[PDB]
Design an enzyme around this catalytic site. Structure first.
Site, PDB file in Angstrom:
ATOM      1  N   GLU A   1      -4.165   3.642 -11.150  1.00 19.77           N
ATOM      2  CA  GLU A   1      -4.842   2.486 -11.522  1.00 19.77           C
ATOM      3  C   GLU A   1      -6.167   2.593 -12.303  1.00 19.77           C
ATOM      4  OE1 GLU A   1      -5.187   1.111  -7.708  1.00 19.77           O
ATOM      5  OE2 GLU A   1      -5.765   2.684  -6.615  1.00 19.77           O
TER       6      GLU A   1
ATOM      7  N   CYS B   1       0.449  -1.457   0.138  1.00 24.00           N
ATOM      8  CA  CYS B   1      -0.344   0.005   0.083  1.00 24.00           C
ATOM      9  C   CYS B   1       0.899   1.273  -0.244  1.00 24.00           C
ATOM     10  CB  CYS B   1      -0.525   0.041   1.411  1.00 24.00           C
ATOM     11  SG  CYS B   1      -1.956   1.608   1.148  1.00 24.00           S
TER      12      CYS B   1
HETATM   13  C1  HEM Z   1      -6.626   6.437   1.373  1.00 27.16           C
HETATM   14  C2  HEM Z   1      -5.853   6.013  -0.161  1.00 27.16           C
HETATM   15  C3  HEM Z   1      -5.077   4.935  -0.295  1.00 27.16           C
HETATM   16  C4  HEM Z   1      -4.740   5.769  -1.465  1.00 27.16           C
HETATM   17  C5  HEM Z   1      -4.439   6.417  -2.303  1.00 27.16           C
HETATM   18  C6  HEM Z   1      -4.147   3.137  -1.212  1.00 27.16           C
HETATM   19  C7  HEM Z   1      -3.987   3.180  -3.051  1.00 27.16           C
HETATM   20  C8  HEM Z   1      -3.539   1.461  -3.021  1.00 27.16           C
HETATM   21  C9  HEM Z   1      -2.825   0.968  -4.011  1.00 27.16           C
HETATM   22  C10 HEM Z   1      -2.441   2.417  -5.350  1.00 27.16           C
HETATM   23  C11 HEM Z   1      -2.705   0.118  -4.050  1.00 27.16           C
HETATM   24  C12 HEM Z   1      -2.260  -1.109  -5.236  1.00 27.16           C
HETATM   25  C13 HEM Z   1      -3.253  -1.283  -5.803  1.00 27.16           C
HETATM   26  C14 HEM Z   1      -3.595  -2.248  -7.248  1.00 27.16           C
HETATM   27  O1  HEM Z   1      -2.864  -2.247  -7.755  1.00 27.16           O
HETATM   28  O2  HEM Z   1      -3.586  -3.504  -6.351  1.00 27.16           O
HETATM   29  C15 HEM Z   1      -2.974  -0.463  -2.142  1.00 27.16           C
HETATM   30  C16 HEM Z   1      -3.113  -1.699  -1.987  1.00 27.16           C
HETATM   31  C17 HEM Z   1      -3.653  -1.916  -0.957  1.00 27.16           C
HETATM   32  N1  HEM Z   1      -3.982  -1.182   0.133  1.00 27.16           N
HETATM   33 FE1  HEM Z   1      -3.956   0.895  -0.088  1.00 27.16          FE
HETATM   34  N2  HEM Z   1      -4.216   3.151  -0.585  1.00 27.16           N
HETATM   35  C18 HEM Z   1      -5.158   3.802  -0.061  1.00 27.16           C
HETATM   36  C19 HEM Z   1      -6.075   3.766   1.453  1.00 27.16           C
HETATM   37  C20 HEM Z   1      -6.208   1.641   1.783  1.00 27.16           C
HETATM   38  C21 HEM Z   1      -6.557   1.640   3.440  1.00 27.16           C
HETATM   39  C22 HEM Z   1      -7.866   2.609   3.944  1.00 27.16           C
HETATM   40  C23 HEM Z   1      -6.429   0.324   3.581  1.00 27.16           C
HETATM   41  C24 HEM Z   1      -6.700  -0.439   4.139  1.00 27.16           C
HETATM   42  C25 HEM Z   1      -7.169   0.043   5.439  1.00 27.16           C
HETATM   43  C26 HEM Z   1      -4.701   0.154   2.476  1.00 27.16           C
HETATM   44  C27 HEM Z   1      -5.035  -1.604   2.133  1.00 27.16           C
HETATM   45  C28 HEM Z   1      -4.330  -2.015   0.857  1.00 27.16           C
HETATM   46  C29 HEM Z   1      -4.172  -3.203   0.856  1.00 27.16           C
HETATM   47  C30 HEM Z   1      -4.088  -4.211   1.680  1.00 27.16           C
HETATM   48  C31 HEM Z   1      -3.264  -3.370  -0.241  1.00 27.16           C
HETATM   49  C32 HEM Z   1      -3.303  -4.569  -0.856  1.00 27.16           C
HETATM   50  C33 HEM Z   1      -4.227  -5.097  -2.019  1.00 27.16           C
HETATM   51  C34 HEM Z   1      -3.300  -6.042  -2.640  1.00 27.16           C
HETATM   52  O3  HEM Z   1      -2.458  -6.999  -2.426  1.00 27.16           O
HETATM   53  O4  HEM Z   1      -3.919  -6.277  -3.835  1.00 27.16           O
HETATM   54  N3  HEM Z   1      -5.224   0.623   1.691  1.00 27.16           N
HETATM   55  N4  HEM Z   1      -3.528   0.590  -2.230  1.00 27.16           N
END
Ligand code: HEM
Ligand code: HEM
Ligand SMILES: CCCCCCCCO[C@@H]1O[C@H](CO)[C@@H](O)[C@H](O)[C@H]1O
Ligand SMILES: CCCCCCCCO[C@@H]1O[C@H](CO)[C@@H](O)[C@H](O)[C@H]1O
Ligand SMILES: C[C@H](O)[C@H](O)[C@H]1CNc2nc(N)[nH]c(=O)c2N1
Ligand SMILES: C[C@H](O)[C@H](O)[C@H]1CNc2nc(N)[nH]c(=O)c2N1
Lengths: 412, 412
Positions: free
Chosen positions: A286, A109
């Site tokens: 994305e 993330c």
């Molecule tokens: C507030 C804005 C946020 C942004 C802009 C952000 C952005 C991102 C991006 C760009 C990815 C990669 C997605 C992909 O290509 O599959 C990601 C993955 C992830 N995010 Fe964030 N995120 C945010 C908030 C959060 C929150 C609120 C949580 C959880 C409480 C979180 C948990 C995760 C997790 C676990 C992954 C891994 C997902 C996977 O492996 O498919 N993120 N996030």
């Protein structure tokens, strides 16, 4: 003692000591070390108890000013609970702490600087699919907030014996359908063909559109999954427009504003939560790069090329670079114009660099999966590309899960 | 049995069986597993002999039609040589085979489809720095070939006891100097400040230019390093021009046409070659993205932004994406116009995908370091980004080395 980390951009050195609290395959998307499968028996007490102790200590150690009496009381109360019930319940405050820490411990993330700003919806009292549907609708509505996106997570009941698991069969809350047309062509999101078919099999009515929001396929208390359509009034979308090319809107494109992961498992203090959807806000690339430019998705790159008058027949012309950039500009411009929160990858990368820096001071580490943190376009132009990172699995943590359809025993 | 590899683009599956012949830190630039340090005693006979046997078997097993008598004869002759001398000499043909295989086993190389097309210069008879200089000049001249670049490698004498090592102190054969000016500004390649200073210390005459080719700092037979200027007639350069923006040439930029790695060690059959420079031809993004756009290098991004009339004060404008692309177009256009071989990253990535595919059929594997194979810009636009890869260290292999200045015992 520690591992040395170097930022080839600023030459700075960081000392990673946090990896010691962790539990060549690098470019593997869903490795076993990141997956937490199903079970058919409770968690062994000899395993649960220690993990619970660790967590209670972590939670109490995070307070600005320690409250030792409560700390001891809690450890003792949790043990007695485990002895008498074989499991235990987290306090709402502990759950909140867990969800943020798990977010904080997410290697993949890039938005982790926002880690402490998270709304938590406690749905651990849920019992039916209809009730899950209701909570999910509340989440979608809260998070969307008329475009001013808010990060939130809905926590459903924890895994008990493993035979009464709550599971959202969807990958994301909002996602478009993909249909194999009669004439052989694909319509909509080509990546969702099997799942769209699954919904169709369960009674869902296919509308054969290019952007049809898929239904929620909910599974509650181990029961067979029930299908529910997401109320159109709840799905906020953005119409794609380019700030210069008027022919852009002629492409008739749009995308949902809510990025919400629906199928991950939350692990905390030996407890497992098979259903806990969460969302943040979109990072432009994305949609602009992954959704629109992946050949296995909407694949609009070549058409945008011709429209621009580029020589789409000569790779060395770098037309693909020229196109993808305009598509990304369209995405960012559109969200900005419709007042829907969104962050460009450049600003995102800088934000994460600041976070990683804050994390190393605060706890001597920050688990990071470089392959996922570096944006799909213009990597070295972003500071993240020049950062050496360590990728380890801490706890709490959000794990992947084996696809529910692969291990579910159908009743009817 | 084997490891499963998936291409998320075409959904194809490959079965890696080659990793079994190998000897979370992923984003580490120079890890110990990729480095082969110095020694002060010969290679133990119990270690050398087995490795030599393995190699001789590999070499003879590669023939279309096996020649068993020679195979046995060679194994026997090599053993006797090791028994009587404590080391051994490879046949020119074995050396050729080794250099190509080592190339073929380079996880971080995207040009491996060219693996079988390599010129080999046997300089194992060398004795002095002046002689190294001569061989290096021949290499530079051969490889440059008036712009029609040819891949080649010059193999110097193998490490004997480890106290008589041949080493090129430079990272590359051709590389620009970096000077700290009196007024505090940096001139030239900021990444070469210490090394430029080193050359100055050894007698080299600083010309304080923006593009001054650094001298060869050669070390032969364990002796202290001697400095040699590269004959200007040998260094082919390309003047940067944009196909539309006439103000581009006003930037007064240029770059050398010869990409040659000078400080790596070739390991084959227990034998080590501390000095064996090699070269291929440039991939556009190395110059356009790395050299010109890295903040710690020439850092021209912002100036190209203003010249284009972009809003360089708002990151979300994606001006950096717009600029870098024009710079890359200038690079490719310039080389193409001056008739100097060069490959764009898009064509490069496709070429490698074909190679990886050929390799899995031919031997069930292809060691690949995703982090290095995916271009510095427009990653997901290239097929390589969607390819799962396994990164293992085979043999023969090209290793990194501890910087010579860090372990060299000065005589005078
Ligand atoms: C507030 C804005 C946020 C942004 C802009 C952000 C952005 C991102 C991006 C760009 C990815 C990669 C997605 C992909 O290509 O599959 C990601 C993955 C992830 N995010 Fe964030 N995120 C945010 C908030 C959060 C929150 C609120 C949580 C959880 C409480 C979180 C948990 C995760 C997790 C676990 C992954 C891994 C997902 C996977 O492996 O498919 N993120 N996030
Ligand atoms: C014919 C054209 C070739 C092309 C276009 C090509 C391209 C590349 C590129 C883009 C890199 C990454 C450089 C960096 O960012 O540091 C690289 C690395 C490498 N190449 Fe190739 N290559 C070619 C030929 C060769 C040859 C002839 C050899 C050796 C016999 C070779 C050996 C290697 C090795 C060992 C590395 C790793 C260097 C390092 O880790 O710093 N390549 N090549
Ligand atoms: C067998 C289980 C033994 C648990 C011992 C727990 C000791 C209390 O643990 C302490 O809690 C404080 C906050 O209250 C923290 O500030 C301290 O760092 C921590 O060591
Ligand atoms: C102790 C060392 C024993 C070495 C045994 C070598 C046996 C010969 O090895 C054979 O060589 C052929 C080519 O000539 C290859 O085609 C065969 O695959 C290979 O097994
Ligand atoms: C094979 C490889 O793991 C896969 O293509 C990756 C690469 N990097 C990624 N990075 C992000 N952020 N999201 C992704 O889905 C992927 N997929
Ligand atoms: C820290 C990280 O390893 C470093 O920035 C990398 C990333 N990927 C790379 N890829 C290539 N081809 N060349 C490089 O020098 C680097 N450097």
């Amino acid at each position: 003692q520690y591992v040395r980390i170097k930022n080839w951009g600023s030459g700075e050195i960081l000392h990673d000591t946090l990896h010691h609290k962790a539990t060549c395959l690098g470019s593997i998307m869903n490795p076993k070390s990141l997956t937490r499968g199903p079970r058919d028996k409770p968690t062994p007490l000899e395993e649960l108890l220690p993990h619970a102790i660790e967590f209670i200590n972590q939670y109490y150690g995070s307070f600005k000013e320690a409250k030792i009496e409560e700390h001891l009381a809690r450890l003792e109360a949790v043990t007695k609970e485990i002895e008498t019930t074989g499991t235990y319940q987290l306090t709402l405050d502990e759950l909140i702490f867990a969800t943020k820490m798990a977010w904080r411990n997410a290697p993949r993330c890039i938005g982790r600087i926002q880690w402490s700003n998270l709304q938590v919806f406690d749905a651990r009292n849920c019992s039916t699919a209809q009730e899950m549907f209701q909570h999910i609708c509340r989440h979608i509505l809260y998070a969307t907030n008329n475009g001013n996106i808010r990060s939130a997570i809905t926590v459903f009941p924890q895994r008990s014996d493993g035979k009464h698991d709550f599971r959202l069969w969807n990958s994301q809350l909002i996602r478009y359908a993909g249909y194999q047309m009669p004439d052989g062509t694909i319509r909509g999101d080509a990546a969702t063909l099997e799942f769209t078919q699954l919904c169709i099999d369960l009674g869902w009515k296919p509308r054969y559109g290019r952007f049809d929001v898929l239904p929620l396929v909910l599974q509650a208390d181990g029961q067979d999954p029930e299908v529910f359509e997401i109320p159109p009034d709840l799905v906020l979308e953005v119409t794609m427009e380019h700030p210069k090319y008027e022919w852009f809107q002629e492409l008739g494109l749009k995308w949902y504003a809510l990025p919400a992961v629906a199928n991950m498992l939350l692990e905390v203090g030996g407890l497992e939560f098979p259903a806990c959807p969460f969302n943040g806000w979109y990072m432009g690339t994305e949609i602009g790069v992954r959704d629109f430019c992946d050949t296995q998705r909407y694949n609009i790159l070549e058409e945008v090329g011709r429209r621009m008058g580029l020589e789409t027949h000569t790779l060395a012309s770098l037309w693909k670079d020229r196109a993808v950039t305009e598509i990304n500009v369209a995405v960012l411009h559109s969200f900005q114009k419709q007042n829907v929160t969104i962050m460009d990858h450049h600003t995102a990368s800088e934000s994460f660099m600041k976070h990683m820096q804050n994390e190393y001071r605060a706890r001597g580490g920050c688990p990071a999966d470089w392959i996922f943190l570096v944006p799909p376009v213009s990597g070295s132009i972003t500071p993240v590309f020049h950062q050496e990172m360590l990728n380890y699995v801490l706890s709490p943590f959000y794990y992947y899960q084996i696809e529910p359809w692969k291990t579910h025993i159908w009743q009817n």
